[PDB]
Design a protein around this ligand. Structure first.
Ligand SMILES: CCCCCCCCCCCCCC(=O)OC[C@H](COP(=O)(O)OCC(O)COP(=O)(O)OC[C@@H](COC(=O)CCCCCCCCCCCCC)OC(=O)CCCCCCCCCCCCC)OC(=O)CCCCCCCCCCCCC
Ligand code: BCL
Ligand SMILES: CC[C@H]1c2cc3[nH]c4c(c3C)C(=O)[C@H](C(=O)OC)c4c3nc(cc4[nH]c(cc(n2)[C@@H]1C)c(C(C)=O)c4C)[C@@H](C)[C@@H]3CCC(=O)OC/C=C(\C)CCC[C@H](C)CCC[C@H](C)CCCC(C)C
Ligand SMILES: CC[C@H]1c2cc3[nH]c4c(c3C)C(=O)[C@H](C(=O)OC)c4c3nc(cc4[nH]c(cc(n2)[C@@H]1C)c(C(C)=O)c4C)[C@@H](C)[C@@H]3CCC(=O)OC/C=C(\C)CCC[C@H](C)CCC[C@H](C)CCCC(C)C
Ligand SMILES: CCCCCCCCCCCCCCCC(=O)OC[C@H](CO[C@H]1O[C@H](CS(=O)(=O)O)[C@@H](O)[C@H](O)[C@H]1O)OC(=O)CCCCCCCCCCCCCCC
Ligand SMILES: COC(C)(C)CCC/C(C)=C/C=C/C(C)=C/C=C/C(C)=C/C=C/C=C(C)/C=C/C=C(\C)CC/C=C(\C)CCC=C(C)C
Ligand SMILES: COC(C)(C)CCC/C(C)=C/C=C/C(C)=C/C=C/C(C)=C/C=C/C=C(C)/C=C/C=C(\C)CC/C=C(\C)CCC=C(C)C
Ligand SMILES: COC(C)(C)CCC/C(C)=C/C=C/C(C)=C/C=C/C(C)=C/C=C/C=C(C)/C=C/C=C(\C)CC/C=C(\C)CCC=C(C)C
Ligand SMILES: COC(C)(C)CCC/C(C)=C/C=C/C(C)=C/C=C/C(C)=C/C=C/C=C(C)/C=C/C=C(\C)CC/C=C(\C)CCC=C(C)C
Ligand SMILES: COC(C)(C)CCC/C(C)=C/C=C/C(C)=C/C=C/C(C)=C/C=C/C=C(C)/C=C/C=C(\C)CC/C=C(\C)CCC=C(C)C
Ligand SMILES: COC(C)(C)CCC/C(C)=C/C=C/C(C)=C/C=C/C(C)=C/C=C/C=C(C)/C=C/C=C(\C)CC/C=C(\C)CCC=C(C)C
Ligand SMILES: COC(C)(C)CCC/C(C)=C/C=C/C(C)=C/C=C/C(C)=C/C=C\C=C(C)\C=C\C=C(/C)CC/C=C(\C)CCC=C(C)C
Ligand SMILES: [Fe+3]
Lengths: 55, 281, 307, 43, 246, 55, 55, 55, 42, 43, 43, 55, 42, 55
């Protein structure tokens, strides 16, 4: 575990930082998409009932 | 006016008809015997379209529509206002397209190049003549041809297609579509690959056809080559139009029912027709 | 009759050709494949080598899993029977979730869950193939025209399967995975939206699709017609214009009054093909979201007669 | 010794920074998860 | 958004279609000006600049950087013929043909035209001579199809001009690019591979009568062919289709 | 088991770490999607019922 | 049997190990999906009925 | 019966070994699928009845 | 022979191949017995 | 040697590691099958 | 000494950290399975 | 009868043995499929009746 | 000789081919006898 | 009739023997398929009645 750093002599940081930057963004958007598609967690739609802004 | 290299090529000869009577240019355009023929038919066909617009009573170019004779006229003549103009404009279109191909043959002769271009264009002419001439003559009425109108010819495509159900099930129509989509794929790739070599990253030298071979082998493990790609783009385009013409010449002449019902011949092959389960069991 | 240069008369085979190095990481490139004498009549005979690497493996594995997920659903729909599988092969279909599920991921595996799983593997496979198409050009110092051209096709594909379903609010709007079922979807789409012929961007998309067959027929015939002058060697005709490029230019100038160059015809080519799916994707994105009946929209915009 | 041509010391420097960026990111991530759990539990 | 118009019938699909017409007009202007990098400015038949240059302007110069040290090309640029053209006017008006003043096959005009290309070989990606005689590239062999080497070469007059003694191959593209023909004086010529028919017992050259094979422009080195030499050979042979009389 | 380390003498370490990373990602997403597609294990729809949220 | 190891004189073990890995995984994935399709063996449904997690 | 080994002087073992490997797999899978589709021999549906799992 | 193998190599190769086939055949024979005991097809 | 370039010594050791993987994998597969069988027999 | 150009020592160096990573990942996964089993048994 | 072996001086045994392998396998497949198609010979369907295994 | 097989090579190779043919065709006859005993077609 | 041996001077024996082999297979199979197509000679259905195998 103390040699987890040894990866950087194996993998180029330019490749790794871009690949991880793309990955994390799409994972985050995927989860926000999943929750917005779920009526029990759509925070905009929850607020519409909580404050009765609906109708 | 000339391209800076053009003068050395403007020699006499190569004309098929008329010798030097029409062997001259008009601006950039070569004339020749069939250029005179072309312009006459083109101008007459265009002017009869504008006159048909007067008879129809619209000046919106998207509503102008020249309909063929009704089915009651068979393959005989119709009145000019009621299908006879369409018939003359069809003669003019055929005269113009054929003269244009023959004018291209003369330009090929004067430049000493192969005849591939007028030969390829002759496929488009045969697809046109399939839809306006050969298939209507087989079916026995000019009214099975399409109308000359920007949107009204799409009504003919729709109404002809839905006469046989979903027209996607015509098996030759499926093959034609496959060539049409594959041709458009290959044209995107070929344009991009040549441009990516001539226009590399900023400051780099022009790439060679060795880099072009290398990129596609790296990408997909094969490379058709400089000569293969131009053979392919030609044959994909011509195959698309051949199978398009074939799909229509059979439609309403040897096949009459819903095209979806054709595919039951496979389902009802007797070694598996009765086996339970699946979609058809 | 003379030789038309459509099939080769003589094949020659040298050594295997390993291709340019540039900045290609050569450990990631395979050995060369076998030669095909059949392909040699029409183009090159050599198969391979191929470059793999990281986006390659990602794309090929996700693409395998997409294909395998559909295949198992077809084997299930066949009831595992190898005869029924071949009888009904074009009739099987992995359908998207039903409309009541909206965009929620809660649909059962048989009612649309496997379609989401299949669609996820397709998403990763196609997008990682795009980055692979960008990086293979970068390693050779080439322009990114091929990756930007591929992005135009991805745009239509993303609209069909992802963006428009989200904007319409259900996965039921997406295309089913199946031979006849995506055809039934295509027909049904046009009927629900009131004849897609009267969509002007479907009209444009067809104009560029016909234009692509027009233009590649013209270009392929032109280059074969001048191939007797070495005109197929287009990069050397760009660098050092020969009689091939001049005869090609004067054919079209004398025919139709204007002409391209050897470099500039490939710009016409790329745009004619790119505009097929660019205008196409817009025309689908407008369908149902902005216009629900294109024929009536056509009547209000002066392209169909009023009632 | 290696593929990238980083030195062993350059690897350690970059890794120490990378891990700190990860810990700052995940620290916010925990606070967001705990906040959403307190607001609206998913279990 | 369905049915929502800013004004008139102008909905969001109207905004799209009108925006596209602006983009298309811009793209067509871009495409045409890109295609004016060769052959412009336009000239009168005497060679002076034509008063009408057309509606599109010349694009700004681009520079291509050529591999293997061969310099840079800027286009558009100064673009002389750089050679004599043996043509004379047949009319005082513009737009008529110019007739050859002498022998057009040898003067290199009309379909016999050739361009002052670079007098060096075309190179492959490594910088070797791209096209070589096959004897000079030891791995190569005819792998399928009728091997022409040793066949008699027949003209369109139906008389034998010579025999095939080698194939000149494109090395990177691995394709047959010329046949070398040994004439009845033992000097050889290159024939373009696309101009010949490799029949079962002969090579037929439909462009040339058997006497015209001596007029084929000869290469200066027996082991390489320059781009200038290629154009002279290919032009001369194709000129025969018009100018080879019976 | 003492000589499993000789895997690294035959396979390039980057190709192995990439291929195994790719594998574990696709597998993990597939199982979470299988469970979301399972009415008895979709945690969002479970909690929606448990707390009388719209479900 | 004792000579079976001479297979590695015939086949490049990198290609065999890659080919074997994807063979095993596809086979295992197919068997699990067969059993999930099989109502009497879908463990996710079996537990759902055992614990009344639907209705 | 003794001389059969000379077949390896005719065919490259790599090709034969791969070809028979693919043959045996595709044949075996085909047979198991014929059995799973045969109701009298589908072991999954047999054991479902034998243990009354159909309810 | 057109594999380039010496005869000695082909004899060696065949001994391994057939020993594999005997092992594969043995498992198959047991498998058919077990299935025939479980559920005869004749 | 043979067709690859591995020697007898190299191949005979590699095979032992391969078979160590085979039996370990197979042993877990036996345990998995027996556990599933005890839970839900398929014969 | 092998195809990869790694030494017998480099191959042991990298394997030691690979197993360090594997055991951590699987330990977290084991904890995740046990938590979910306690929450909602699938057997 | 004595000279039929001269066929090996005409046809190269590699091509012959491949072509013969395909031929004989596809012929066997024809016959078994004809028998499975035949009510009096479909051995699986016969065994089902003989042991009452259906319904 | 199109294949280059010497007369001795062809007289050898044929003998092994025939040996396999007789073995294969013998096993086929045993199979036919058993299936005839099960269910005579003639 | 003696000079029929001259055929082998004109037609390559390989390219004749291939043509004969394909021809004889096709002719034999065509006849067997025609015989099965007639109940008068379908030896399977003659046997089915004779041995009362479908009743
Ligand atoms: C439904 C969608 C369709 C969609 C249709 C398809 C759309 C997609 C394809 C787009 C293709 C673009 C074409 C292009 O690049 O044009 C520029 C190029 C430049 O040539 P140049 O050589 O470098 O320069 C011109 C000049 O030096 C040529 O020599 P010269 O001066 O001696 O002779 C003149 C020529 C023809 O020139 C002209 O007609 C005037 C310039 C036309 C420019 C067109 C674009 C800009 C203005 C557009 C609005 C102009 C409004 C007035 O030769 C002759 O005149 C000899 C007589 C024969 C021609 C008789 C024409 C009779 C009048 C008919 C109406 C013509 C209208 C243009 O060539 C030309 O100028 C001549 C082109 C002639 C054929 C054009 C066909 C394409 C459609 C019409 C033009 C594009 C706009 C849609
Ligand atoms: C009843 C049927 C309807 C109809 C309904 C539709 C619908 C619905 C659509 C079209 C669309 C199209 N129609 Mg329409 N259409 C009809 C009538 C026609 C007629 C005619 C003569 O009547 C024509 C010529 C056309 C023509 C066309 C095209 C211009 C256009 C598709 C462009 C394209 O490239 O797609 C093919 C290209 C793609 C789908 C892009 C694919 C890219 C992805 C990334 C590829 C992934 C590959 C995958 C991973 C597999 C890999 C395998 C490899 C071996 C590894 N239509 C009638 C009116 N049409 C489309 C459009 O754009 O409309 C505006 C569309 O969505
Ligand atoms: C065969 C493969 C493809 C192909 C090839 C092809 N087309 C070609 C060529 C080639 C190789 C040419 O050499 C030639 C050319 O010069 O190109 C610039 C041509 C050409 N392809 C053309 C168009 C075209 N090609 C099409 C298709 C295709 N062309 C195929 C897919 C299509 C469609 C709809 O698919 C169209 C519209 C022209 C640009 C040109 C032929 C020009 C020509 O014939 O000029 C002389 C005639 C005129 C200038 C005008 C004639 C006017 C008529 C007398 C009146 C109008 C009648 C018409 C029926 C009305 C229709 C109304 C519509 C709304 C229905
Ligand atoms: C601009 C519009 C046109 C367009 C453009 C276009 N398409 C493109 C490109 C461009 C410019 C590319 O660069 C790209 C490409 O690479 O082309 C070669 C592509 C491409 N266009 C494609 C298809 C395509 N394009 C189409 C259309 C269009 N493409 C338009 C006409 C169409 C249709 C329906 O019209 C199709 C089907 C692909 C050929 C390619 C994108 C490839 C891709 O994304 O693949 C993803 C999937 C995989 C990588 C693998 C799938 C599974 C395989 C079976 C591999 C399995 C491997 C595994 C290891 C096997 C193990 C087996 C075990 C059992 C042992
Ligand atoms: C020294 C020379 C001496 C010459 C002697 C005289 C010879 C005259 C006969 C000529 C023989 C061949 C005629 C064609 C076949 C025939 O019998 O047709 C007779 C049918 C009549 O069918 C009628 O009868 C048909 C049935 S049937 O065929 O009789 O069974 C029926 O289907 C149809 O509706 C009905 O109209 O008519 C036609 O087929 C139409 C011919 C159309 C020609 C002009 C076309 C103009 C319209 C637009 C298309 C333009 C295309 C341009 C192409 C460049
Ligand atoms: C679906 O089926 C129907 C219902 C339609 C019925 C009919 C089906 C039908 C027609 C079936 C036919 C089946 C046949 C033809 C089966 C044939 C099977 C064969 C050929 C099996 C062979 C197996 C061989 C094996 C397993 C050999 C393994 C060899 C090994 C392990 C060792 C390999 C050798 C070495 C490593 C060499 C080392 C030495 C040196 C010198 C390097
Ligand atoms: C890629 O190329 C190489 C050469 C490198 C090959 C690599 C091959 C390789 C090394 C693969 C490795 C694979 C691994 C790590 C596989 C591991 C598999 C495991 C651990 C599987 C475990 C399965 C367990 C199962 C199926 C258990 C099932 C139990 C059941 C169904 C019943 C349980 C009953 C109850 C809980 C009830 C009673 C008890 C209680 C508490 C109620
Ligand atoms: C539901 O059922 C169906 C309807 C789908 C029917 C399915 C029936 C059917 C046809 C199943 C077939 C299954 C088969 C053929 C399975 C075969 C499996 C095999 C061959 C498994 C082998 C596994 C081997 C393993 C796990 C080996 C691992 C080796 C490792 C980890 C070490 C590798 C060696 C080294 C690192 C070498 C180190 C040394 C040096 C000197 C470099
Ligand atoms: C439909 O079927 C179902 C889905 C239901 C069942 C499918 C069942 C099936 C076939 C499962 C197969 C499972 C297998 C074969 C699992 C194998 C798992 C293994 C071998 C996992 C190993 C993981 C190792 C990890 C995560 C870690 C390694 C760490 C290392 C080497 C240290 C270096 C790394 C770093 C310093 C991290 C740097 C940071 C980043 C972000 C890369
Ligand atoms: C109503 O039903 C029907 C439609 C089918 C009615 C009938 C229709 C009809 C027109 C039928 C016609 C049938 C005909 C034309 C039958 C002809 C049959 C023939 C051509 C039979 C020939 C057989 C020849 C054989 C088996 C020859 C074998 C030769 C062998 C084994 C040796 C070959 C020689 C060598 C290996 C020696 C090589 C020598 C050297 C020096 C290397
Ligand atoms: C419903 O009725 C139907 C429609 C199905 C009627 C069908 C009627 C019909 C046309 C049937 C046709 C059947 C035919 C033509 C069958 C022919 C079968 C033959 C010829 C089979 C031959 C088999 C040969 C074998 C198994 C030979 C094996 C040889 C071996 C194992 C030895 C290999 C080794 C060597 C040769 C050593 C190499 C030597 C050296 C020196 C390197
Ligand atoms: C021999 O048997 C084997 C099992 C071995 C193989 C059988 C192989 C076989 C029969 C395969 C069949 C494949 C077929 C017929 C495929 C057909 C595909 C067609 C026609 C597709 C058409 C259109 C697809 C489109 C437009 C898809 C777009 C998808 C997109 C844009 C992805 C969007 C992503 C999602 C909705 C997923 C979102 C999920 C998350 C987690 C964010
Ligand atoms: Fe090109």
């Amino acid at each position: 575990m103390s040699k987890f750093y040894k990866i950087w002599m194996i993998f180029d940081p330019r490749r790794v930082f871009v690949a991880q930057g793309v990955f994390l963004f799409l994972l985050a958007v995927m989860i926000h998409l999943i929750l917005l598609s779920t009526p029990s967690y759509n925070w905009l739609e929850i607020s519409a009932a909580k404050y009765n802004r609906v109708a | 006016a000339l391209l800076s290299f053009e003068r050395k090529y403007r020699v006499p000869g190569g004309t098929l008809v008329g010798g030097n009577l029409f062997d001259f240019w008009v601006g950039p355009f070569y004339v020749g015997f069939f250029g005179v023929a072309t312009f006459f038919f083109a101008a007459l066909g265009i002017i009869l379209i504008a006159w048909s617009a007067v008879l129809q009573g619209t000046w919106n170019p998207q509503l102008i529509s020249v309909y063929p004779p009704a089915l009651e006229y068979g393959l005989g003549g119709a009145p000019l206002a009621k299908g006879g103009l369409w018939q003359i404009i069809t003669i003019c279109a055929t005269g113009a397209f054929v003269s244009w191909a023959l004018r291209e043959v003369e330009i090929c002769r004067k430049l000493g190049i192969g005849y591939h271009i007028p030969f390829a264009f002759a496929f488009a002419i045969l697809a046109y003549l399939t839809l306006v001439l050969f298939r209507p003559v087989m079916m026995g009425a000019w009214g099975y041809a399409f109308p000359y109108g920007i949107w009204t010819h799409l009504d003919w495509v729709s109404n002809t297609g839905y006469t046989y159900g979903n027209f996607h099930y015509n098996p030759a129509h499926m093959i034609a579509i496959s060539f049409f989509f594959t041709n458009a794929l290959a044209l995107a790739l070929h344009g991009a690959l040549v441009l990516s070599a001539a226009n590399p990253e900023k400051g780099k030298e022009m790439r060679t056809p060795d880099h072009e071979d290398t990129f596609f082998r790296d990408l997909v493990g094969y490379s058709i080559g400089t000569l293969g790609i131009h053979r392919l783009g030609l044959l994909l385009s011509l195959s698309a139009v051949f199978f398009s013409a074939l799909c229509m010449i059979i439609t309403g002449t040897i096949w009459f029912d819903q095209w979806v019902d054709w595919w039951q011949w496979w389902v009802k092959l007797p070694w598996w027709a009765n086996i339970p389960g699946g979609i058809n069991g | 009759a003379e030789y038309q240069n459509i099939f080769s008369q003589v094949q020659v085979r040298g050594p295997a050709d390993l291709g340019m190095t540039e900045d290609v990481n050569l450990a990631n490139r395979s050995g060369v494949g076998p030669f095909s004498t059949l392909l040699g009549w029409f183009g090159n005979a050599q198969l391979g080598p191929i470059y793999l690497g990281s986006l390659g493996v990602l794309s090929l594995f996700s693409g395998l899993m997409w294909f395998f997920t559909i295949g198992i659903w077809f084997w299930y729909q066949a009831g595992w029977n190898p005869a029924v599988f071949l009888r009904d092969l074009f009739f099987f279909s992995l359908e998207p979730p039903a409309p009541e599920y909206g965009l929620s991921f809660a649909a059962p595996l048989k009612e649309g869950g496997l379609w989401l799983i299949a669609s996820f593997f397709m998403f990763v496979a196609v997008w990682s193939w795009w980055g692979r198409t960008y990086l293979r050009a970068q390693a050779l110092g080439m322009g990114k025209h091929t990756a930007w051209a591929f992005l135009s096709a991805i745009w239509l594909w993303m609209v069909l399967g992802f963006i428009r379903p989200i904007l319409m609010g259900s996965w039921s709007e997406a295309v089913p995975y199946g031979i006849f079922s995506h055809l039934d979807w295509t027909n049904n789409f046009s009927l629900v939206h009131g004849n897609l012929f009267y969509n002007p961007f479907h009209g444009l998309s067809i104009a560029f699709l016909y234009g692509s067959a027009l233009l590649f027929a013209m270009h392929g015939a032109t280059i074969l017609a001048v191939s007797r002058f070495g005109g197929e060697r287009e990069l050397e005709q760009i660098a050092d214009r020969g009689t091939a490029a001049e005869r090609a230019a004067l054919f079209w100038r004398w025919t139709m009054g204007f002409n391209a160059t050897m470099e500039g015809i490939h710009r016409w080519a790329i745009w004619m093909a790119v505009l097929v799916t660019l205008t196409g994707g817009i025309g689908i994105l407008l369908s149902g979201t902005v216009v629900d009946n294109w024929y009536v929209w056509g009547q209000n915009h002066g392209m169909a007669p009023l009632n | 010794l290696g593929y990238t041509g980083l030195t062993d010391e350059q690897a350690q420097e970059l890794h120490s920074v990378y891990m700190s960026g990860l810990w700052l990111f995940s620290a916010v991530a925990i606070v967001a998860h705990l906040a959403v759990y307190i607001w609206r539990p998913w279990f | 958004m369905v049915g929502v118009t800013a004004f008139g019938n102008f909905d969001l699909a109207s905004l799209a279609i009108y925006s596209f017409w602006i983009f298309l007009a811009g793209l067509i202007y871009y495409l045409q000006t890109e295609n004016m990098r060769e052959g412009y400015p336009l000239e009168n038949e005497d060679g002076t600049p034509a008063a009408n240059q057309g509606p599109f302007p010349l694009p700004k110069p681009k520079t291509f950087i050529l591999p293997h040290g061969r310099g840079t090309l800027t286009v558009p640029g100064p673009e002389s013929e750089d050679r004599p053209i043996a043509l004379a006017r047949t009319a005082v008006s513009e737009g008529f043909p110019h007739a050859p003043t002498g022998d057009p096959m040898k003067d290199g005009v009309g379909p016999a035209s050739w361009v002052a290309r670079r007098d060096l070989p075309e190179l492959d990606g490594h910088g070797h001579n791209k096209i070589k005689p096959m004897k000079a590239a030891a791995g190569f062999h005819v792998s399928a199809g009728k091997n022409p080497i040793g066949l008699p070469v027949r003209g369109c007059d139906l008389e034998i001009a010579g025999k095939v003694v080698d194939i000149w191959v494109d090395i990177p593209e691995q394709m047959a690019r010329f046949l070398e023909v040994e004439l009845k004086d033992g000097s050889t010529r290159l024939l373009p591979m696309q101009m010949v028919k490799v029949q079962s017992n002969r090579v037929h050259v439909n462009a040339l009568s058997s006497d015209l094979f001596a007029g084929i422009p000869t290469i200066k080195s027996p082991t390489e062919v320059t781009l200038l030499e290629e154009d002279k050979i290919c032009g001369y042979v194709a000129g025969g289709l018009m100018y080879a009389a019976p």
